[PDB]
Design a protein around this ligand. Sequence first.
Ligand SMILES: [Cl-]
Ligand SMILES: [Cl-]
Ligand SMILES: [Cl-]
Ligand SMILES: [Cl-]
Ligand SMILES: [Mg+2]
Ligand SMILES: [Mg+2]
Ligand SMILES: [Mg+2]
Ligand SMILES: [Mg+2]
Ligand SMILES: [Mg+2]
Ligand SMILES: [Mg+2]
Length: 584
Amino acid sequence: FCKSWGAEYIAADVVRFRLWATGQQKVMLRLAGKDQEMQANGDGWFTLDVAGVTPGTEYNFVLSDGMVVPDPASRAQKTDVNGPSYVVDPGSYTWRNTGWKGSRWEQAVVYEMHTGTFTPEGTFRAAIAKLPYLAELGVTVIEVMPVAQFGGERGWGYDGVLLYAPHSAYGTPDDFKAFIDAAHGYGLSVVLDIVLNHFGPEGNYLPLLAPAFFHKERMTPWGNGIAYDVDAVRRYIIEAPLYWLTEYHLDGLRFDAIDQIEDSSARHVLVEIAQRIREDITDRPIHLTTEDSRNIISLHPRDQDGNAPLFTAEWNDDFHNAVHVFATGETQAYYNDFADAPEKHLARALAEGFAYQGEISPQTGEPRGVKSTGQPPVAFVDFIQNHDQVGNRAQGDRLITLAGAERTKVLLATLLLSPHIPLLFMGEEYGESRPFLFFTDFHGDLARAVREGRAKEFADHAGENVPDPNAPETFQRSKLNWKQQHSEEGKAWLAFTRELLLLRQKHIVPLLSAARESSGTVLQTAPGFIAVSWRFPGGTLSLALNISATTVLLPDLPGKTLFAWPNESTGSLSQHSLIVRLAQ
Ligand SMILES: [Cl-]
Ligand SMILES: [Cl-]
Ligand SMILES: [Cl-]
Ligand SMILES: [Cl-]
Ligand SMILES: [Mg+2]
Ligand SMILES: [Mg+2]
Ligand SMILES: [Mg+2]
Ligand SMILES: [Mg+2]
Ligand SMILES: [Mg+2]
Ligand SMILES: [Mg+2]
């Protein structure tokens, strides 16, 4: 992929190095230790063409004063975020599965994976050995947490600063391509979590190169707001997703915190990103998902034939959040919006998409959301676990530890047989109980600021003892336990998950393509009990769930029984049970 920023081959034997640095009068290129002056070619841009440069050659930029910095648009770092960048050959990796052309979004079952903790080794190469396992299980889309190089050698990925460079701790560019290529061969699409709303705190020299890269007033909760209205900035931001998709042959992207991407440009940066992706990549579906707290739908339209010209689906945190209150009784902070009749919110989310479609949010005191019933069910990504819902907790508790195994089983089945697109957090499939903690790898003042900034999020829970994010044990405690995965109890969870996914592809997925609207109805709710129906062209799907300690009577649920757990009862649902039916 060809980019405005960075180091690219412009001929078989010539690399063009390009940097925008409005805060600088001059910039030098330090190439394999030797300094050459770059040409200032208007509007703060500096450029230099160098003949003969081989792939793997190290380089840095040197500022007017003598400060040595990584390429902010580095394609790869030699070691850490502050060290040399290196010239990458886009063609060094030989793609084997070039006939892959993806799969329809309707069959998506997403599996969110953190590269560093997914395996003991914590690398892309080690993760390849687990791909057959995931494919066998019935996962169809791997979502890789952000790989943009960040400070230190451990982190979730949201402190990324070199937005074009996969973290050297995970592997080289070719290691990541090998993982993607292998995934394709195993029948898995791969999407990447991408952060375009802020830069992390270590290794970001853009403020020193070009203060205008960031706004003077605007600040997100995690760093300065980005000046998307400035042409050079817009090039850096928009070309990043295009680069990842083209150069890494990815199947989509998940955009972090889009509600924190403020742009007053006539054409919003996110709209332009989506439009360019749909015009530039046409040989395969590209599944663009977004994380937005606003419960809008304007970025997820469908045309009459069901195509998504902008974004494909939206993270529907209302589902998780209603489930969490419903199943655990916790009502603090953002969960308080679901404290009143969580069953009603849950049923509404299942049936219609959003629980909040314009009603006042208790937590904000403002209207939240818009009508969502006209969206197809596949425009929502639902989940009972993800990196945030687990990791934003002081002790990183997984749902199974809060709701218990029996309740978690019926919630997992609910998720997997529902018409919304399901996302699983790595480890759920075998009943993992290890926490997923917030971990980092910083030093000095930054380490202290991050550690105390984290503790302060839980200061009102006085009694808490938040694990130091910088401590290696915080990271080690979060590693998936593959022993458990191989255990008998783990094999029971795996068998449960596997059957659910088979049932999903056999019975649910075929209903989804023709569904142009929610088509969902709440039949009944009561404390601990929901019953919902979806009327699709291909059949009427019904679901009822009871997590109360006593049996409940059911409405009529037409059709044959797709799944009943633990048992099926006629006209009733026992404690801690679920039933799913389909009438055709
Ligand atoms: Cl599709
Ligand atoms: Cl598409
Ligand atoms: Cl949300
Ligand atoms: Cl869980
Ligand atoms: Mg070549
Ligand atoms: Mg399959
Ligand atoms: Mg958010
Ligand atoms: Mg959302
Ligand atoms: Mg389609
Ligand atoms: Mg108001």
